[PDB]
Design a protein around this ligand. Structure first.
Ligand SMILES: Nc1nc2c(ncn2[C@@H]2O[C@H](COP(=O)(O)OP(=O)(O)OP(=O)(O)O)[C@@H](O)[C@H]2O)c(=O)[nH]1
Ligand SMILES: Nc1nc2c(ncn2[C@@H]2O[C@H](COP(=O)(O)OP(=O)(O)OP(=O)(O)O)[C@@H](O)[C@H]2O)c(=O)[nH]1
Ligand SMILES: Nc1nc2c(ncn2[C@@H]2O[C@H](COP(=O)(O)OP(=O)(O)O)[C@@H](O)[C@H]2O)c(=O)[nH]1
Ligand SMILES: [Mg+2]
Ligand SMILES: [Mg+2]
Lengths: 202, 51, 439, 206, 430, 432
């Protein structure tokens, strides 16, 4: 058989991601890769982007095909594809860099499927972790003194992952991106702790 | 010299009482405002329209 | 690095060319505006859209086309409608006066002063490209403006460019249903010039779809809306293999090298499947095994011809999608065992097989149900002679009373020109008979 | 009119019917082969749109009746109705919105430096040293300039800000290059050297 | 772009346009003040087809008005849409034609017929591209026919590359309004045939029959007759002025309606037309066309249309229709009267489609097919000429203005041959 | 340290000459008042005053007060040196004789000094740009007389002239044939390189590409304006391959006599349609030689090709030059003369065209200007003679000229040259 209802109903959806390859050599560390995921029949695709004058032979790197994770031995479902996660294909390893604005709307559209997408579950995910501190406001107070050592009122992502992981809390990358992307007033990847704080407390 | 529709009254057929100088009237997409009346005309208002 | 450009001329030429883009445009994600969505800001992948278009440095895309017509009505309205933004603003050349169905007007009177602009346009249109496989021109034969300009353009394409393969999808008037009053005249004269310049020509007579629409689509009041579209799928199928991954690809130049037995005889007829009402399409699986058998059904011939009235020289049929190649060997096999269809004597095998994986997309509000498995065929059968015989006679009476001739002479055309046409036809009926006789 | 309402956005995503879809669950149909009077097939001569699709328009009471058409209901070219974008599978160009903004902004800035109220340098008060001209003897030798009245400049600012993400819409919608239409008095008034595409803005704006 | 102008000789042509220019006014949506008050984009796209533009923004037709006497234009100009016309174009004669063809064709117009020629010429020159003319006149009137033809004569000498259309009214056998009708009903035909391209013959008599037998009203008036005829104009150019699957311009019909150079006379009748009350009971459909398009009572021709073999015809439908019912029915429309259709011209019924329907109706059609049935009129009219001429009755009038009987003798001679050559094709067989 | 002095004579140069400065100024960065707005190479047309505004390197002359004064009151009143706009009072009224024999003699002196003053600022004076239309009485001469003295006043200085010749059929004046015949006589033996700028060829550019149904002499300016900015571009910013004024008179004039060349400019596409195409090198340069784009009303196909030098501006890469030129050669419709086996001089510049405000020209990343000198040019010359031939036959409009100082024999002498110039063209084009 071949899923009949699967093909006719959910055919149109197509997700696009940008990523970077990890391997043994320096050879192809800086060139970029664009990953296309057809959810109609769970077929993975590899496409190559080559900048002008770069000298690399632009074109197709892998044809759309179907292959699976050796460890869990279960075909690919929509769950594994997430921002920052690494998917294993063939004898390569790819990393997802950024999502397609078409995708996110599709990404955030279906909670209960991509839980990390649901905005509400994200903050609380961090909220439920605040039980260790005796005083709730203490958990409020310390945060400002941990994530932002300089208390500048604005922070950048590279420190935030280290800053948060500095305390010890465990957040999968797919949760981290969703929070910051919400508070970017001018859409330049600049957090507003106050807006985060105001939601956290006021 | 033929019947003309009256815009002012629900597209009705005109009546003698309509003509009132000092208040404008419109006929078939045109702007008419009278100035005066023939002194013969004044009598006719002066014998029947009175109520 | 592979492409094919479109030629449009004649009222029906413009009208038909209308449908091809929406089916083509929607396939690649190109909305009417040109920027694919306002949302998808990744792109730079699946390099195939060059097969029909070109890139503009940044922004939208341009269809590789030039629009021509001698009337302002249809062309002008196309400048205020839904697709106002796609076609190049200056590429839709327009005339000033109509041909008025007078063939002589379109070949020696009014078409002379407008062919230059297109021929000028074609030069660059080929210039910007790199891998031009061949030209495709759609022209309703039964059009005084469509024909006279239609016939000429094919003439210059032979000398200025030459060996490039040119394809033309003409639509002769229906065997009994007719629209104009002098269609037979603009039939043959349009028939002569293209005889020795067009490598490929396929039958698309209008009436055939009329039965095609009713029998399957179940349309009791079909209008010109649904006649063109089903053809559009015909255009898509033939060029579908040149812009998507395929197990055994077929090239446009690999089409006219396997369906024209002699340089002289260059006509063939086609037919498509499956057409079935979306409200009842799915209850039958046009079945993968029986899809091909649907190909040879006379009732589904897009041309009013009876393939059963002659032998088959060769079949050019293309599927689409994920049909297992093994089925192609089997299903096609059953045809040979069939006795209702017989081949010519000298041709052992006349089947060219092309398999593609991409499935045909569904139009919005159209008739065809979004199907799983389909297939289409392009064939050259001696029965093609059947139509010409009926076409020939229609002129015989007309010239007998030389009616309507007087205006033609007023266009400067040589009366002897008509003389050659009937001489031309003599071989047409004659040559087929010689080919039709077994050794 | 069946297509644009049916397969509604609630039908495709996480729904039952697909793009084509067996669209008989949502509404009442009659599965082709059938005889009778559905009350809306023979009378109104609806074209194309295969019989199955015709039914849904029949009973659902959408219709459009009367021998006399309500002006608009007849004044459409069927070209438009047939080929109306892609509509319902899954959910125009902002062009000429910047054009207007790109239009007045040029107008305003040129109107923001007239040197209002004796703000010109000491030079230029009289004509150039070589002037010829009249130079009437009994006249105020200097030049007098009125200039915009404060609020006039500020008035343009509001429109410029309002247009950018404001209630104001795109002006008309205009053709491409060669439309041979009347274009609302391109000749009745000369309007000669105005960059033909820009004429439409000069034409329909009036 | 493919526009036409208007000229109308005598009273007859002037009245025809009265309800005409009104009609062209309402379809595009123009008020008596000429201001634009439309709703959709269509009603203004091709507004140049009958109107030129001037400063101030008011739209007006391009109509040439001329007549030999002041009585007539002093009546129409005041009526509805009467102010639209260009007062500059107004010129006219001061003595009147006097119901005599002789006086109005050699004495008066010759001195002044240059005047229209200038007014005729100028309006043609300023346009971008000129398509054709439509002239309405009367054969039973003095100035109308007389001055009517020569103006056609000179124009043909200067514009041989365009088409010319003239709607002529010949006197039906019953309702004859002039005793001297045969002569001007006689002399005119010669000149018109030798230069005319497309001719449509309409008889007032058949107009009365249509009114009673279709509209079933009580007292028809000249206004309504203008109501019936004026619409018939809308058949020819309604396709020519808006979109359509297969547009059918004048030359499209011409190449598709004139089988021979010397047969340029047609007979037409309009549909639909139903009594006011019965408008609801009838169910308009394409089937309702064929039964009434070819039906006898819809033929505005005094001659019975079923008394001959049809040669060719064209169809210009109006309203949203799928051609399928347009096409299939016609082929049925030919076989069912194959004995009614000549045999050597296969497929002699033409069809066309216009998206915009006539006002007030969801579907309407105008039918034009070349038929020999008209042969009754020429034969019936022909018999009238020799009966009066042989006696030379009223001959002093024509002989009193410099004419001879040689022109009259020539006029009768060519008439028989034309019909004689017209009737030969009736018996032609393959 | 490159300089050039601009000399404007006659209204036609006045209107265009006024036009040309807007194109340059906005390409420099100087506001209309001429004061740097708190922002070297821009010296090419300017001389610093030490502090403050800048003086354009131009001088204006005329015998008519109306045209010149209009500049001296409008937006740019503070642009030029106040006194340098020398102006007379009596116009020749298209009487060529009036412009060089009774009135112009005295006023020429003022011009000579002013240029004499302007050059002193210049240290490496390169040449002169002269603007003047053919169809002008004073316009024909005044430039000539300055040409005669200057050729003997500045020695071997190489110079150029953007003449504007009369259309084959469309003409505003009635005595145009005379001055044109003499003007060539006057300008035949005094100039280095002069271009063909007959107006009628210019209009044809507007309709086909810019889609304008009614452009006046104004629109002719900016389109013509780009030509001036074209040639001089390489001298006044960087480039990967320079081409100077001095390196023109030694690359387009094989013989001392044949010196008439017709140029072209491109691309020219409005801002409301161009965005559909990438504006590629291959598609553009083929527009340069296209018969529909030559700016002089003559056929670039009727005659042989001798040598054509083209200058590019934009961010073009040279390889788009090397590949394209190979394509042009192989064509069988544009053919080169026998005696110039290679005739391409390729120029490349980096800065983009300076989009005019506020103007009609769209925004593009590449522009091309081609200088064509083809044997077909003779068509303009011969057609001029025939007009002159028929007119002079009747001694018409002659007495108006002798009385102002013209000897009757003067007209006869020129007619020899044009055919004499005519004789040269046939000889040069004949293959060996
Ligand atoms: N398949 C198809 N055929 C059409 C269509 N419209 C018209 N035709 C056919 O085309 C024939 C006439 O040729 P056209 O191309 O429409 O007319 P034309 O080429 O513009 O010539 P002119 O009408 O004289 O200007 C008719 O007899 C129809 O059979 C259409 O929409 N689809
Ligand atoms: N391209 C262009 N040519 C112009 C323009 N104005 C005038 N001409 C040309 O100049 C001719 C008119 O004579 P001009 O040379 O301008 O006269 P002038 O420069 O004032 O000198 P005089 O004739 O002595 O007054 C016309 O035939 C035009 O061809 C313009 O604005 N642009
Ligand atoms: N269509 C139409 N024809 C009319 C009307 N009244 C009269 N006629 C015809 O006009 C003819 C008279 O024309 P006439 O004025 O003598 O023409 P003239 O002498 O050239 O001006 C009569 O034979 C009538 O048949 C009318 O109201 N409508
Ligand atoms: Mg046509
Ligand atoms: Mg002058």
């Amino acid at each position: 058989r071949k899923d009949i209802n699967k093909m006719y109903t959910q055919d149109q959806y197509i997700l696009r991601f940008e990523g970077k390859l990890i391997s043994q050599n320096k050879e192809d560390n800086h060139r970029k890769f664009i990953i296309s995921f057809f959810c109609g029949d769970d077929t993975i695709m590899v496409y190559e982007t080559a900048d002008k004058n770069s000298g690399i032979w632009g074109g197709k790197f892998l044809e759309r095909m179907n292959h699976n994770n050796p460890i869990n031995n279960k075909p690919y479902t929509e769950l594994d594809f997430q921002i920052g996660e690494i998917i294993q294909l063939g004898v390569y390893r790819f990393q997802l860099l950024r999502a397609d604005e078409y995708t996110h709307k599709y990404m955030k559209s279906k909670p209960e499927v991509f839980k990390e997408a649901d905005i509400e579950y994200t903050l609380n995910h961090l909220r439920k972790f605040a039980t260790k501190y005796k005083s709730y406001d203490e958990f409020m107070v310390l945060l400002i003194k941990n994530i932002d050592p300089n208390r500048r009122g604005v922070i950048d992502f590279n420190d935030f992952v280290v800053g948060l992981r500095r305390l010890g809390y465990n957040l999968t990358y797919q949760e981290i991106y969703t929070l910051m992307r919400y508070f970017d007033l001018d859409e330049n990847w600049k957090l507003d702790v106050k807006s985060l704080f105001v939601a956290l407390g006021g | 010299k033929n019947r003309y529709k009256n815009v002012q009254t629900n597209n009705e057929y005109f009546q003698p009482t309509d003509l009132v100088v000092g208040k404008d009237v419109i006929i078939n997409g045109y702007s008419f405002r009278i100035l005066e009346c023939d002194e013969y005309t004044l009598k006719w208002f002066a014998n029947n329209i009175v109520q | 690095m592979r492409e094919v450009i479109s030629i449009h001329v004649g009222q029906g030429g413009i009208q038909v060319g209308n449908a091809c883009w929406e089916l083509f445009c929607l396939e690649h994600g190109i909305q009417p505006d040109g920027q694919m969505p306002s949302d998808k800001t990744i792109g730079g992948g699946d390099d195939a859209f060059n097969t029909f278009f070109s890139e503009t440095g940044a922004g939208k895309h341009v269809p590789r086309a030039v629009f021509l017509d001698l009337e302002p009505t249809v062309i002008d309205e196309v400048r205020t409608g839904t697709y106002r933004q796609l076609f190049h603003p200056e590429q839709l050349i327009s005339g000033k006066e109509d041909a008025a169905n007078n063939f002589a007007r379109g070949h020696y009177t009014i078409g002379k002063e407008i062919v230059d602009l297109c021929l000028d346009r074609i030069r660059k249109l080929a210039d910007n490209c790199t891998g031009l496989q061949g030209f495709l021109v759609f022209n309703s034969v039964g059009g005084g403006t469509g024909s006279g300009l239609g016939s000429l353009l094919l003439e210059r394409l032979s000398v200025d460019y030459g060996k490039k393969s040119k394809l033309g999808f003409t639509i002769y008037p229906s065997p009994q249903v007719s629209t104009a009053v002098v269609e037979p005249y603009n039939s043959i004269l349009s028939t002569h010039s293209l005889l020795e310049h067009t490598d490929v020509a396929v039958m698309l007579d209008n009436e055939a779809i009329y039965d095609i629409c009713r029998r399957n689509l179940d349309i009791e009041r079909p209008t010109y809306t649904n006649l063109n579209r089903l053809i559009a799928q015909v255009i898509s199928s033939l060029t579908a293999s040149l812009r998507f991954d395929g197990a055994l690809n077929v090239d446009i130049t690999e089409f006219q090298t396997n369906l024209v037995p002699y340089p002289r005889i260059h006509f063939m007829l086609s037919s498509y499947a499956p057409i079935i009402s979306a409200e009842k399409a799915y209850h039958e699986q046009l079945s993968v095994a029986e899809i091909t058998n649907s190909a040879f059904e006379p009732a589904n011939m897009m041309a009013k011809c009876d393939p059963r009235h002659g032998k088959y020289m060769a079949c050019s049929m293309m599927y689409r999608g994920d049909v297992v190649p093994k089925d192609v060997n089997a299903s096609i096999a059953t045809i040979k065992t069939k006795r209702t269809i017989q081949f010519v004597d000298w041709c052992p095998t006349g089947f060219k097989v092309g398999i593609n994986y991409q499935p045909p997309t569904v139009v919005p509000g159209g008739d065809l149900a979004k199907v799983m498995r389909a297939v289409c065929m392009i064939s050259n059968s001696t029965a093609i002679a059947e139509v010409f015989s009926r076409l020939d006679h229609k002129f015989d009476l007309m010239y007998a009373k030389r009616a309507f001739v007087h205006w033609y002479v007023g266009e400067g055309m040589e009366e002897g020109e008509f003389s050659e046409a009937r001489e031309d036809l003599a071989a047409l009926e004659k040559d087929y008979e010689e080919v039709g006789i077994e050794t | 009119n069946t297509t644009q309402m049916i397969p509604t956005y609630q039908d495709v995503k996480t729904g039952t019917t697909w793009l084509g879809g067996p669209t008989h669950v949502l509404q009442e149909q009659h599965i082709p082969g059938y005889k009778g009077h559905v009350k809306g097939v023979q009378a109104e001569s609806l074209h194309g749109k295969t019989f199955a699709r015709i039914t849904a328009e029949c009973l659902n009471n959408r219709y459009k009746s009367g021998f006399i058409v309500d002006d608009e209901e007849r004044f459409k070219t069927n070209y438009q109705l047939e080929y109306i974008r892609p509509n319902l599978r899954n959910n125009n160009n902002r062009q000429r919105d910047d054009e207007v903004e790109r239009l007045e902004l040029i107008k305003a800035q040129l109107n923001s430096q007239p040197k209002t109220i004796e703000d010109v340098p000491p030079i230029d008060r009289v004509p150039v040293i070589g002037y010829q001209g009249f130079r009437p003897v009994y006249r105020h030798p200097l030049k007098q300039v009125k200039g915009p009245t404060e609020d006039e400049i500020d008035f343009q600012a509001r429109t410029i800000l309002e247009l950018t993400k404001g209630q104001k819409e795109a002006p008309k919608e205009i053709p491409i290059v060669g439309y041979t239409g009347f274009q609302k008095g391109i000749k009745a008034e000369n309007m000669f050297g105005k960059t033909f595409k820009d004429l439409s803005n000069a034409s329909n704006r009036i | 772009m493919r526009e036409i102008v208007h000229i109308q000789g005598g009273q007859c042509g002037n009245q025809i346009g009265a309800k005409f220019w009104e009609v062209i006014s309402d379809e595009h949506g123009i008020d008596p003040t000429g201001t634009y008050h439309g709703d959709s984009d269509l009603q203004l796209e091709r507004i140049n087809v009958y109107y030129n533009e001037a400063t101030g923004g008011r739209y007006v037709p391009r109509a040439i008005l001329m007549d030999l006497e002041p009585g007539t234009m002093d009546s129409v100009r005041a009526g509805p849409f009467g102010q639209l016309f260009r007062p500059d174009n107004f010129v006219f004669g001061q003595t009147g034609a006097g119901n005599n063809w002789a006086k109005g064709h050699y004495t008066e117009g010759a001195e002044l017929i240059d005047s229209v020629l200038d007014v005729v010429r100028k309006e043609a020159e300023g346009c971008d591209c000129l398509q054709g003319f439509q002239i309405t006149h009367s054969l039973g009137g003095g100035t109308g026919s007389g001055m009517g033809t020569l103006l056609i004569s000179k124009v043909r000498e200067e514009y041989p590359d365009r088409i010319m259309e003239t709607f002529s009214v010949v006197p039906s056998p019953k309702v004859s309004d002039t005793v001297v009708e045969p002569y001007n009903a006689t002399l005119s035909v010669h000149q018109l045939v030798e230069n005319a391209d497309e001719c449509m013959v309409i008889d007032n008599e058949a107009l009365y029959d249509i009114c009673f037998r279709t509209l079933k009203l009580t007292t028809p008036t000249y206004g309504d007759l203008n109501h019936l005829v004026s619409a018939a104009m809308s058949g020819v150019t309604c396709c020519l002025r808006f979109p359509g699957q297969l547009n059918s311009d004048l030359r499209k019909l011409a190449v598709n309606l004139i089988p021979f150079p010397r047969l340029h006379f047609f007979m037409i009748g309009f549909a639909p037309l139903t009594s006011r009350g019965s408008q609801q009971y009838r169910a308009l459909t394409v089937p309702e066309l064929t039964q009434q398009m070819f039906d006898a009572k819809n033929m505005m021709c005094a001659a019975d249309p079923r008394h001959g073999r049809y040669l060719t015809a064209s169809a210009l439908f109006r309203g949203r229709m799928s051609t399928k019912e347009v096409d299939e029915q016609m082929l049925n429309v030919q076989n069912k009267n194959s004995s009614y259709f000549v045999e050597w011209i296969p497929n002699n019924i033409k069809s066309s489609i216009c998206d915009i329907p006539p006002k007030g109706l969801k579907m309407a059609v105008t039918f034009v097919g070349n038929s020999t049935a008209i042969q009754e009129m020429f034969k019936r009219v022909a018999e009238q000429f020799t009966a009066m001429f042989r006696r030379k009755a009223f001959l002093h009038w024509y002989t009193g203005e410099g004419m001879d009987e040689m022109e009259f003798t020539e006029a009768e001679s060519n008439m028989n041959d034309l019909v004689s050559e017209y009737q030969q094709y009736q018996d032609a067989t393959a």
